[PDB]
Structures are given as structure tokens and as C-alpha cells.
Write a protein that binds this ligand. Structure first.
Ligand code: CLA
Ligand code: CLA
Ligand code: CLA
Ligand code: CLA
Ligand code: CLA
Ligand code: CLA
Ligand code: CLA
Ligand code: CLA
Ligand SMILES: CC(=O)O[C@H]1CC(C)(C)C(=C=C/C(C)=C/C=C/C(C)=C/C=C/C=C(C)/C=C/C=C(\C)C(=O)C[C@@]23O[C@]2(C)C[C@@H](O)CC3(C)C)[C@](C)(O)C1
Ligand SMILES: CC(=O)O[C@H]1CC(C)(C)C(=C=C/C(C)=C/C=C\C(C)=C/C=C\C=C(C)\C=C\C=C(/C)C(=O)C[C@@]23O[C@]2(C)C[C@@H](O)CC3(C)C)[C@](C)(O)C1
Lengths: 171, 89, 80, 176, 73, 62, 148
């Protein structure tokens, strides 16, 4: 059975029946690493990047909140981490991020040990996910599809911005 | 369970992940890891042997430190490749 | 001269004594009274056996490779 | 013809080739004949190359753009510090070849190997299929005998340098 | 600041001078973690800065080693 | 086989003559628990040179 | 020769060629040999061409200008940075992500040596397809020799 994405290569089997399975796993990481771990990672990376990209672009198009610490004046999205970490913004958000991440680690452990928590599920805002499994699945693919794009998007923004010192267009 | 007999151990002893990896892949990884470790050592050696400029322990670099850990991994990976080969996978 | 050369001397002489002793014990072991010949030595035989120790290095090696020196688990052992 | 020098009888005066059969003690501590055979072959093959090397260097041959050294006994260090890259590449290949020799073969020390001592799978010219059995065996004997000769020669070289006058004929040739 | 920034070398700068008199500020330094080696000239004992660095290193090694066995996770 | 004048090797671990050779003197045929009577050329820590063993504890050596 | 194609001189007549007998001595590796043969051939063909085109025309840009690069051979050194590095990256990525996985498949009997999913533009007839395959192999051998 050949993969849809790479017709000349065999299909990755362990990834079958998963959201966003286009048959693309040329190096076969799935055959070796636990799938639930991989799935959780893809989702987390995507969600983080989605927000990261938005933040980068937003600040670059102005957006600074009010009142703004003086040290934060005249800072691009890039070259803002250090001013912020000095002020205390980064540290004050790191604390909460850490808390959630630690509890999440417990969830991941239980998921891998077999508890029933689907990878990436934190039971948040499921009300808007629809009722029919079909619509639920479409929503999930929507998140994943946007997420994959976001990962690539963020990379471009940060790399192009620093390399050529440019603003929003071609950030 | 892990008790084994013969001339080669079963793949179960290589863990829950490497037990499914092909022998060749492990070999490639092993060689690469050893290379990184050796490179790190040689490069760091120059830093330690360069006149002055290493005061306050400036010779210690985060990348080289991490790279140096490839050496032990190289051993493990090369041993694992052999086990996988004998096991047929 | 301080240690190596004198050392060879000791090894040669010591081996000579040990080899000849083992030879005599094994030789008289098959006699009418194997225990009387240990308290009252048969001087004639002893002298003969004693003279044959000058080539102990060669003899020993030959006996080792002939499986005649080291025994094979047919010897008494402790209960455990 | 086997051991034409020994009138056709195996030459193992010391009996090294039977020590694995000592039943009294030291279990699996003595090499099985297979290990010994392979070692003899490798030693011989390496000795032959080494001897040619010393001879070539002494005769005055020097590869284009190669490390320059005078003492054949100290040239290795020069190469290591003059051309570190080249040294490394050769060393890597040598190591791979050495490990591949046993990795696939098995344990010869305990006599459980599958390979025929001496086979490193390097018959690239396919002579094993292009030649008659007798020819092959003849070449094998030639390789072993010539290899043994080289080993003695390497010993003579070492003795010459270590023990002055140990080898007289070479001194006549005007070596050292 | 140096710790989190990654510029750890700062904590090893300005080691106590060889003319430092113990229990006093004469000839003192500011270093807190160093690998000088040897003994304090006046007290003829190992440098305190080195001991601090020693225990810090040992700490990391043991903490890492304590994550080797399965414990309900 | 265990029989008069046969030579056997003791297989009783508690015996002073374990893994040693002895000569079977007589084997009783009345159903006693330890029928064979073996004699040794070496005295034990007590000074005896004989003991009675069962046929299973004895292996013929020849 | 029975298992794989080729063995035909450039003229077209049968010409089994393996003087060293490498195939027999190292049979289990013949699949790799075939893949490399095609790889070297395809690469050679592209290299033979282009060289000529380098001479005729150049990509718009100063570095690519004939004045900047009078000799096609000199381009390697002159454009080592920027270009060359870009090509290196993409070619290397391809080998690690595509070529390597593909080889593993062919070593297990799931891929025919040389296949990378470009048969979508290939003739349906098996015979004509076979002819084209032969054309590729022969041309590749010629090109390799042509390059040097
Ligand atoms: C790819 C081939 C290759 C190999 C195998 C080596 C190997 C080596 N190089 Mg080298 N080198 C190479 C290419 C290579 N180099 C190239 C292309 C260059 C560019 C010029 C250099 C430039 C260079 C310099 C400038 C120096 C070296 C040095 C060394 C030695 C350092 C050992 C060390 O510190 O590791 C310690 C790390 C470990 C993990 C130790 C354990 C690993 C083993 C025991 C060490 C040996 C590696 C082994 C032989 C690899 C071959 C077998 C492999 C399949 C396992 C080592 C023998 C240094 C040296 O010592 O020279 C005197 C040195 O100064 N190299
Ligand atoms: C990966 C996520 C991420 C990270 C690390 C940062 C990091 C940063 N942002 Mg930022 N941002 C993000 C996402 C992120 N942002 C997104 C998604 C938006 C869109 C609303 C913004 C909008 C935004 C503005 C408008 C400003 C920053 C600013 C800053 C800097 C100071 C921190 C601060 O005041 O936060 C403020 C962050 C917010 C108010 C985000 C809005 C609330 C979020 C979306 C809800 C979080 C959901 C969970 C609870 C700091 C470099 C400030 C700065 O210094 O600019 C130079 C600033 O003025 N960001
Ligand atoms: C002669 C050396 C030698 C050899 C041949 C082996 C052989 C083996 N060891 Mg072992 N081991 C040794 C020395 C050795 N051990 C020593 C000195 C220690 C430390 C006391 C260990 C600690 C050790 C542990 C903790 C485990 C093994 C395991 C194994 C088995 C699988 C190997 C593996 O997965 O590696 C591949 C390993 C890696 C790729 C990880 C690299 C991590 C680096 C080294 C840090 C195999 C039977 C495993 C086993 O049997 O599973 C039940 C296992 O879990 N070994
Ligand atoms: C975090 C506090 C801290 C500080 C300031 C130092 C300071 C120092 N260490 Mg040290 N060390 C520490 C923690 C620390 N150590 C711990 C916890 C360990 C155990 C892993 C070590 C293990 C260690 C070794 C093994 C060595 C040092 C060395 C050094 C000296 C130069 C390297 C340097 O400044 O950092 C440079 C480091 C960075 C810039 C970033 C590293 C980030 C890592 C890789 C993560 C300097 C005196 C070196 C030295 O001079 O001794 C000969 C040396 O060889 N240290
Ligand atoms: C055990 C085998 C052995 C070893 C370890 C060496 C080792 C060495 N040789 Mg040597 N050599 C050998 C066999 C060997 N050779 C043989 C068989 C020949 C005859 C072809 C030569 C001919 C030779 C010449 C002509 C030169 C060396 C040189 C050297 C030194 C640099 C390495 C080199 O050029 O490789 C030698 C290359 C090969 C062995 C194979 C190439 C074919 C190094 C110390 C060079 C040197 O440092 O000069 C002093 C040098 O100029 N060798
Ligand atoms: C205790 C140390 C140790 C152990 C247990 C092994 C074990 C092994 N090595 Mg090995 N090796 C070691 C140290 C060790 N290596 C060192 C220090 C080097 C040089 C840096 C090598 C270089 C080496 C090579 C080049 C090869 C092996 C290979 C092997 C495997 C085949 C068996 C054999 O004897 O060869 C086996 C798993 C072979 C293998 O299967 O490759 C992974 C092989 O070809 N080894
Ligand atoms: C990925 C490439 C590759 C592969 C698949 C093999 C595969 C094999 N080699 Mg190997 N080998 C390789 C590279 C490789 N080798 C290299 C690079 C070297 C040295 C430079 C060797 C040196 C080598 C030796 C010396 C021997 C093998 C032997 C063998 C076979 C047992 C096995 C099929 C063995 C063989 O053919 O047994 C007769 C054998 O003895 N190999
Ligand atoms: C092995 C093949 C090969 C290689 C290594 C090069 C290398 C080079 N060419 Mg060149 N070229 C080739 C084939 C090749 N060419 C062919 C077949 C043609 C058309 C017949 C050209 C036409 C061409 C022009 C017109 C110019 C170059 C130039 C150059 C130099 C600048 C970078 C470059 O590629 O320009 C860009 C080259 C192209 C845009 C040619 C198209 C690319 C080929 C034809 C298709 C490759 C297949 C496909 C892209 C595979 C992609 C998959 C990828 C992920 C692996 C560089 C030295 C420039 C220069 O300065 O020369 C000195 C220049 O002006 N080339
Ligand atoms: C309690 C409760 O229930 O609350 C609810 C609230 C609410 C809102 C309903 C919920 C939600 C969902 C959320 C938060 C959804 C938000 C999702 C988000 C934020 C999705 C962004 C994707 C960004 C992308 C795709 C970027 C593309 C960017 C692309 C493709 C680019 O090319 C950018 C580009 O720069 C490059 C790289 C190169 C440049 O040269 C050119 C340009 C500029 C073009 C939840 C989860 O249900 C919870
Ligand atoms: C048998 C055994 O013991 O194996 C153990 C070994 C060990 C090490 C304990 C293990 C572990 C954990 C890990 C992941 C170890 C790896 C690496 C380790 C030790 C730690 C991680 C990351 C460090 C980073 C990312 C660097 C931050 C450093 C940064 C961001 C900086 O460089 C800051 C700095 O750049 C500025 C901004 C400017 C420069 O002018 C100054 C410098 C350059 C300093 C293993 C592998 O799991 C198992």
C-alpha cells in the first residue's frame, strides 16, 4: 500500500485513522516513536506557533498596549524579549505557563499509560466543536491545518526579519 | 522476561523505541554521534591551548558540551545496531 | 643484576625442588605401602628422581599440554 | 605440499594449537584454532605491507606532496601531525574493515564462527570463479608462506634496531 | 543576571589575590565560582570558591542520575 | 554396575569421599535402605575407611 | 543480466559487461548498484547539458554575468557562497528525506530502482515504457563518459 503524498513509498501504518494523516512520514518516525507523543507534540507546537505568529505580527503593526513601560519603547517584535525579560513581563507569564505545562505533563503520562485522554485534549471549550463526529473531526483538521501553516509562518517571519531587518511586509 | 540465551540478545532489551529501528539507521546515527563528539573535543582543545583569552573559563561552550555527550550515545547506538542486525531487523 | 637475573635463579631452583617432590610422591603412591615411603624415604629412587629436575621447565609444559598436570573435577569438594 | 620444510608434518612444537583442549582449567581462555588461523593471516598480510613500506621509503621513494620524515620508526607521528585529515580518514576505514571482519562472522575464539579464516570478502577480481581449485589453493599457500616470511623480516628489522648485530647479513647489505 | 543570561564566566572573575588575608577584606576578590586549584596562600587550605563550584557540579550530576528509575510516571 | 569388587565413585555430597573412588565389598539383597558396602583407602576425619551407600549414590567407574 | 536490463552495447546488440564479476561477488548489493548507476547517469546528463548553456546564456544578475564568470568551470569557486550553498542544502535535504527512504524500500522489494513517482508522465504501454527506460540508461552511460 503506497502513501497518498509519496506514491512511490510504502504507507505509514501507525498513523492511519488520525486527523491530518496525508500519508507523509518519509523518515518513518511514527514506526519507532509512540504515536500519541508525536500527535501531542504536533498539536502543541502548532498552537504555540499560531499565537507566536500573531503576536509577532501584531506588535510589528504597532499594537503596543497602554500604558507601556518606558523600556519597551522603540522595540520591534524582534529585539523585545530582552527588554521585556528585564521589566518582568516574561517572567510573570512564564510562571503561569509553567504551571499549566506541569499539570499537562501529568496528563501526558496518563495518556501514554492508557487513561483515555486523547492526545491534545484538555477539555476546553468543547462546546463549539459541534455535535456530529464528522463536524468535530472537521474542526480538528481545521485547527491542525492552521497550526501547520502557523509553524512555517513563524519561522519565516523571525528568520527573514532578523536577517534583513525588515518590517511587516516580509517581516 | 529480559533473560536471554544464545549468541545475541532479543530486541526487547533495546527499549520501547530502538527495538523497532532498523540496523542501518542506528549505524548511521552512531557514526554521526561519534563524529560530533570528536569534533567537539578537537575544537575545545584549541581553545584550551590558545594563548590567554580563556580566562574565567571562556573555553567552555554550551554547544561543545552537548556535542561531547554524543560519545556515550555512539557506544550505545553502535551496540544496538549489532543487536538489531543479528535479530534480523 | 639487582633483581631479574637473581630472580631467574630462584625460579629455576624452586621449580626443580617442587617438580622432583611431586614426581617422587606420585611415584611412590602406587607402592605396597604408600605411607611408609613418605616417612622412610627410598633414598636410591629419590636421588634418581632428584637428578631429573634440571629440565623441569620443559617437562612441565609437556605435561600441561598432555592433560596430565591439571585434574578435572573428579576431586572431593565441600558440601555447598 | 604440506610443510615441505618439516617433511610433511605439522609444526607445533610448543603445542599452542592444542591448549584449547586442556580440560583441567581456564575454560574458553585459549584461542580455538580458527582464531589462531585468522590471526596468522592478518599478521602476515600486515607484515608484508609494512616491509614493502620500509623498503620503499628507504630506497628513496616519496609520494607527491607527502609528509616528510627520515626515520621509518617515527614517521607515523609526523603524518599524524602533518596531515591530520588524511590520517583520520585512513584510520576510520581501517577500523571499519577490522570490525566488519568479525561483526558478521561471529566468535572464532570459541570456535563458533562461520567464515573461513582469511576471507574478508575482497575478491573483487572474481578470481575465485575465474580460476581452478588447485590454482586457488596454491595461491592460498603462497600467501601464507610469503606472509610468514614477511613476519620474520619485520622481526629482523626490529631486532636490528633494538639489538645491535643481532642480524648480520642485513648489516653487510649496509642497512644501519 | 549573569546566571540566567548565560554569561556564567562573570562569577569566576576577580579571584581573591595571593595577598589576601583571611577573614578580612585586604586583597579580597568578588569571584564565587572558580577552578583555581591548590591552596589559599595564607590559610594553606583549599579555596572556598572552588569548593562551592565543586558542590554545584556534583549537584547537577546527582540530580540527573536520580531520574533513571521508573516511578509511577 | 554395583557388585562385589567393583569400583565406584561416591555421589553423596555429605560424604568425606565425595567424587572419590572406592571398591564395593558386598551388596545386601534383603531390601535394606543402604545395601552397598564400599571401602576406601583413606580414613575420614573420624578414622573410618568404610561406609554403606545406596546404589543410586554410587556410579561405576571403569 | 537476467534479472535486470542493460547488457546491451550502445549499438543495440547484446553485450553482457561485467569483467570483474562484481555482481556475483557482491550480489545482494546489485539493487544499490543499479540505483547509483541511474543516479550517476541522470546527474551526468544534466551536467553535460547546462555546461553548454552556461556558455550560451546566463541568469539575469551580476554574479551570473559572463564578465563575472568567464569560464563555466570557474563558477564553482566564484559562486561558492550564496549559490552552490543553496543548491547544497536542497540536494542534501532531498537525499536525507527522499533518496534514503526510497533506497530502503528498494532494498526490501517495494520499489523498482530509479522510481521516484514521475511515471505520471509515462506511456501506458509496457513495451514503449521499457524502451524509454533503456534510452535513459544508455544515454546516461554515454553522458557519464562524456563528462569525463
Ligand atoms: C573522518 C575521519 C577522521 C577520524 C577518524 C579522525 C580521528 C581523530 N582526529 Mg581528526 N581530522 C579529520 C578526520 C578524522 N579524524 C579531518 C578531515 C581533519 C581536518 C584536518 C582532522 C583534523 C584533526 C586535528 C587538527 C586533530 C585531529 C585529532 C584526531 C584524534 C582525536 C581523538 C579525540 O580527541 O577524540 C576523543 C573523543 C572520544 C569520544 C574518544 C573515544 C573515541 C575513540 C576511542 C577515539 C578514536 C576515534 C576512532 C579511531 C575513530 C575510528 C573508528 C570509528 C569507526 C569508531 C582522532 C584520532 C586530534 C589529535 O589527537 O591529533 C593528534 C587533533 O589534534 N583531527
Ligand atoms: C507565544 C505567545 C506570545 C508571547 C511569548 C508574547 C510576548 C510578548 N508580547 Mg505578545 N501577543 C501575542 C502572543 C505572545 N506575545 C498574541 C497572540 C497577541 C495578540 C493579541 C499579542 C499581542 C501583544 C501586544 C498588543 C503587546 C504584546 C507584548 C508582548 C511583550 C510583553 C509581554 C506582554 O505585555 O504581553 C501582552 C500580551 C497580550 C496582551 C496578549 C493578549 C492576551 C492573549 C492573547 C491571551 C492569552 C491566552 C491565554 C491566557 C512580549 C515580548 C507587548 C509589548 O511589549 O510589545 C512590544 C504589547 O504591547 N503582545
Ligand atoms: C561490556 C559492556 C556492556 C554491554 C555489551 C552491555 C549490554 C547490554 N546492556 Mg548494559 N551496561 C553496562 C555494560 C554493558 N552492557 C554498564 C557498565 C552499565 C552501567 C552499570 C550498563 C547499564 C545498562 C542499562 C541501564 C541498560 C543496559 C542494557 C543493555 C542491553 C541493551 C543495550 C542497549 O540498549 O544499549 C543501547 C543504549 C542506548 C542507545 C542508550 C545510550 C545512553 C548513554 C550510554 C548514556 C545489552 C544486553 C539495557 C537493557 O538490558 O534493558 C533491559 C538497559 O536498560 N545496560
Ligand atoms: C551555573 C553556575 C555555574 C557557573 C557560573 C560556573 C562557572 C564555571 N564553570 Mg562550571 N559547572 C556548573 C555550574 C557553574 N559553573 C555545574 C552545575 C556543573 C555540572 C554540570 C559544572 C561543570 C563544570 C565543568 C565540567 C567545567 C566547568 C567550568 C567552569 C568555568 C568556566 C565555564 C563557565 O564559566 O561557564 C561556561 C558555560 C556556559 C557559557 C554555558 C553552559 C550551559 C550548559 C552547557 C547548559 C567557570 C569557573 C570549566 C572549567 O573552567 O573547569 C576546568 C569546566 O571544565 N564547570
Ligand atoms: C603497514 C603498512 C604501511 C604503513 C603503516 C605505512 C605508513 C606510512 N607510509 Mg608507507 N608504504 C607502504 C606501507 C605502509 N606505509 C607500502 C607497502 C609502500 C609501497 C607502495 C609504501 C610506500 C610509501 C611511500 C613512498 C611513502 C610512504 C609514506 C608513509 C607515511 C605517510 C603515509 C603514507 O603516505 O602512506 C603510504 C601509502 C600507502 C601505503 C598506500 C599507497 C598506495 C606513513 C608513516 C610517506 C612518507 O611519510 O614518507 C616518509 C611516503 O612518501 N610509504
Ligand atoms: C566495551 C566496549 C565495546 C563493546 C562491548 C563493543 C561491542 C561491539 N562492537 Mg565495538 N568498538 C569499541 C568498543 C566496544 N564495542 C571501541 C572503543 C571502538 C573504537 C572506537 C569500537 C569500534 C567498532 C567497530 C569499528 C565495529 C564495532 C562493532 C561492534 C559489535 C560487533 C561485535 C564486535 O566485537 O565487534 C559489538 C556490539 C562492529 C559493529 O557491528 O558495528 C556497530 C564494528 O564493525 N566496534
Ligand atoms: C553499507 C555498506 C556495506 C554493507 C551493506 C556491507 C555488508 C557486508 N559486509 Mg562489509 N564493509 C563495508 C561496507 C558494507 N558492508 C566497508 C565500507 C568495509 C571496509 C572499508 C567493509 C568490510 C568488510 C569485511 C572486511 C567483511 C565485510 C563483510 C560483509 C558481509 C557479511 C555483509 C553483507 C564480510 C564478508 O563478506 O564475509 C566474507 C567481511 O568479512 N565487510
Ligand atoms: C548538474 C547540473 C547543474 C549544476 C550543478 C549547475 C550549476 C550552476 N549553474 Mg547551471 N544549468 C544546468 C545544470 C546545472 N547547473 C542546466 C541543465 C541548465 C539549462 C540547460 C543550466 C542553466 C544555467 C544558466 C542559464 C545559468 C546557470 C548558472 C549556474 C551557476 C549558478 C547557480 C545556478 O545553478 O544557476 C541557476 C541555474 C538554473 C536556473 C538552471 C535550471 C536548473 C536545472 C536545469 C534543473 C534542475 C532539476 C530540478 C531543479 C531539480 C530540483 C529538485 C531539488 C530540490 C533537488 C552554477 C555553477 C548561472 C551561472 O552563473 O553560470 C556560471 C547561469 O547564469 N545554469
Ligand atoms: C473558554 C473558551 O472556550 O474560549 C474559547 C475561545 C475561542 C476563541 C472560541 C477558542 C479558540 C480558538 C482560537 C484561539 C483560535 C485562534 C487561532 C489562531 C490564532 C490561528 C492563527 C493562525 C495563523 C496563521 C495560519 C498564520 C498564517 C500566516 C501565513 C500563512 C503567512 O504566510 C504570513 C506571512 O509572514 C509570512 C510567513 C511571510 C511574509 O513575508 C508574508 C506573510 C505576512 C503573508 C477556544 C479554543 O475554543 C477557546
Ligand atoms: C549518562 C548521562 O549522564 O547522560 C545525561 C547527560 C545530561 C547532560 C544530564 C542530559 C541531559 C539534559 C540535557 C538536554 C543536556 C544537554 C545540554 C545541557 C547541559 C543543557 C541543555 C541545554 C542548554 C542550552 C539549550 C543552552 C543554553 C545557553 C544559552 C541560551 C546561552 O548560550 C547564553 C549565551 O548565548 C548568550 C545569549 C550570549 C553568549 O555570549 C553567552 C552564552 C553563549 C552563554 C542527558 C543527555 O539527558 C542524559
Amino acid at each position: 500500500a503506497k502513501s497518498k503524498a509519496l506514491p512511490w513509498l510504502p504507507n505509514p501504518s501507525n498513523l492511519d485513522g488520525r486527523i491530518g494523516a496525508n500519508g507523509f512520514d518519509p523518515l518513518g518516525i511514527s514506526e519507532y516513536f509512540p504515536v500519541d507523543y508525536l500527535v501531542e507534540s504536533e498539536i502543541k507546537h502548532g498552537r504555540v506557533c499560531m499565537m507566536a505568529w500573531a503576536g509577532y505580527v501584531a506588535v510589528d503593526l504597532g499594537a503596543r498596549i497602554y500604558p507601556l513601560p518606558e523600556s519597551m519603547q522603540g522595540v520591534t517584535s524582534a529585539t523585545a524579549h530582552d527588554p521585556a525579560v528585564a521589566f518582568g513581563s516574561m517572567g510573570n507569564m512564564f510562571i503561569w505557563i509553567a504551571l499549566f505545562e506541569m499539570v499537562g505533563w501529568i496528563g501526558l503520562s496518563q495518556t501514554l499509560q492508557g487513561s483515555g485522554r486523547e492526545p491534545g485534549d484538555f477539555g476546553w471549550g468543547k462546546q463549539f466543536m459541534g455535535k456530529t463526529q464528522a463536524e468535530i473531526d472537521t474542526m480538528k483538521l481545521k485547527e491542525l491545518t492552521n497550526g501547520r501553516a502557523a509553524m512555517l509562518a513563524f519561522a519565516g517571519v523571525v528568520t527573514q526579519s532578523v536577517l534583513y531587518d525588515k518590517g511587516f511586509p516580509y517581516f | 522476561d529480559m533473560t536471554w540465551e544464545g549468541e545475541y540478545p532479543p530486541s526487547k532489551v533495546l527499549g520501547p523505541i530502538m527495538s523497532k529501528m532498523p540496523s542501518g539507521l542506528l549505524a548511521i546515527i552512531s557514526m554521526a554521534s561519534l563524529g560530533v563528539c570528536v569534533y567537539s573535543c578537537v575544537q575545545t582543545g584549541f581553545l584550551l591551548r590558545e594563548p590567554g583569552a580563556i580566562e574565567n573559563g571562556s573555553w567552555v561552550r554550551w554547544y561543545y558540551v552537548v556535542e561531547g555527550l554524543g560519545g556515550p550515545l555512539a557506544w550505545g547506538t553502535h551496540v544496538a545496531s549489532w543487536i538489531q542486525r543479528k535479530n534480523g531487523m | 643484576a639487582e633483581f631479574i637475573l637473581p630472580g631467574f635463579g630462584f625460579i629455576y631452583i624452586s621449580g626443580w625442588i617442587g617438580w622432583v617432590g611431586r614426581k617422587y610422591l606420585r611415584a611412590v603412591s602406587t607402592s605396597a605401602n604408600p605411607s611408609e615411603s613418605e616417612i622412610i624415604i627410598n633414598v636410591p629412587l629419590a636421588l634418581k628422581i632428584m637428578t631429573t629436575g634440571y629440565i623441569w621447565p620443559i617437562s612441565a609444559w609437556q605435561e600441561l599440554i598432555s592433560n596430565d598436570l591439571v585434574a578435572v573435577s573428579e576431586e572431593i569438594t565441600v558440601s555447598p | 605440499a604440506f610443510n615441505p620444510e618439516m617433511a610433511g608434518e605439522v609444526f607445533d612444537p610448543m603445542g599452542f594449537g592444542k591448549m584449547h583442549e586442556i580440560k583441567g582449567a581456564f575454560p574458553n581462555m585459549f584461542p580455538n584454532p580458527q582464531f589462531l588461523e585468522e590471526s596468522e593471516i592478518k599478521h602476515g598480510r600486515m607484515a608484508m605491507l609494512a616491509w614493502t613500506g620500509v623498503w620503499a621509503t628507504e630506497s628513496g621513494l616519496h609520494f607527491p606532496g607527502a609528509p616528510v620524515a627520515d626515520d621509518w620508526t617515527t614517521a607515523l607521528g609526523v603524518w599524524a601531525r602533518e596531515d591530520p585529515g588524511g590520517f583520520g580518514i585512513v584510520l576510520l576505514l581501517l577500523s571499519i574493515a577490522e570490525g566488519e571482519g568479525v561483526s558478521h562472522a561471529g566468535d572464532n575464539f570459541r570456535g563458533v564462527s562461520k567464515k573461513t579464516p582469511g576471507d574478508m570478502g575482497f575478491d573483487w577480481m572474481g578470481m575465485t570463479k575465474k580460476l581452478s581449485a588447485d590454482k586457488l589453493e596454491r595461491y592460498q599457500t603462497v600467501e601464507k608462506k610469503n606472509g610468514r616470511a614477511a613476519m620474520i623480516a619485520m622481526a629482523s628489522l626490529f631486532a636490528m634496531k633494538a639489538i645491535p648485530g643481532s642480524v648480520p647479513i642485513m648489516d653487510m647489505l649496509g642497512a644501519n | 543576571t549573569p546566571f540566567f543570561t548565560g554569561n556564567w564566566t562573570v562569577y569566576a572573575e576577580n579571584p581573591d589575590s595571593a595577598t589576601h588575608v583571611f577573614n578580612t577584606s585586604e586583597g579580597s576578590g568578588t569571584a564565587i565560582l572558580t577552578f583555581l586549584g591548590g591552596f589559599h596562600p595564607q590559610t594553606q587550605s583549599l579555596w572556598l570558591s572552588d569548593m562551592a563550584h565543586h558542590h554545584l557540579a556534583i549537584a547537577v550530576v546527582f540530580i540527573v542520575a536520580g531520574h533513571m528509575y521508573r516511578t509511577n510516571f | 554396575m554395583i557388585d562385589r569388587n567393583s569400583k565406584v565413585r561416591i555421589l553423596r555430597k555429605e560424604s568425606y569421599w565425595f567424587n572419590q573412588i572406592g571398591t564395593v565389598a558386598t551388596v545386601d539383597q534383603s531390601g535394606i535402605r543402604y545395601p552397598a558396602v564400599v571401602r576406601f583407602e583413606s580414613v575420614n576425619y573420624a578414622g573410618t575407611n568404610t561406609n554403606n551407600f545406596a546404589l543410586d549414590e554410587l556410579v561405576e567407574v571403569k | 543480466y537476467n534479472h535486470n536490463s542493460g547488457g546491451v552495447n550502445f549499438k543495440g546488440d547484446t553485450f553482457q559487461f561485467d569483467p570483474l564479476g562484481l555482481s556475483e561477488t557482491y550480489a545482494p548489493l546489485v539493487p544499490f548498484f543499479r540505483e547509483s548507476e541511474i543516479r550517476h547517469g541522470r546527474t551526468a546528463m544534466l551536467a553535460v547539458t547546462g555546461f553548454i548553456v552556461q556558455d550560451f546564456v546566463r541568469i539575469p544578475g551580476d554574479a551570473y554575468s559572463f564578465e563575472a564568470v568567464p569560464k563555466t568551470v570557474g563558477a564553482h569557486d566564484a559562486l561558492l557562497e550564496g549559490p552552490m550553498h543553496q543548491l547544497l542544502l536542497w540536494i542534501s535535504l532531498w537525499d536525507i528525506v527522499i533518496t534514503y527512504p526510497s533506497i530502503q524500500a528498494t532494498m526490501k522489494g517495494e520499489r523498482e530502482p530509479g522510481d521516484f513517482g514521475w511515471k505520471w508522465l509515462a506511456p501506458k504501454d509496457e513495451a514503449t515504457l521499457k524502451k524509454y527506460e533503456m534510452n535513459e540508461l544508455l544515454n546516461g552511460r554515454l553522458a557519464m563518459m562524456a563528462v569525463g
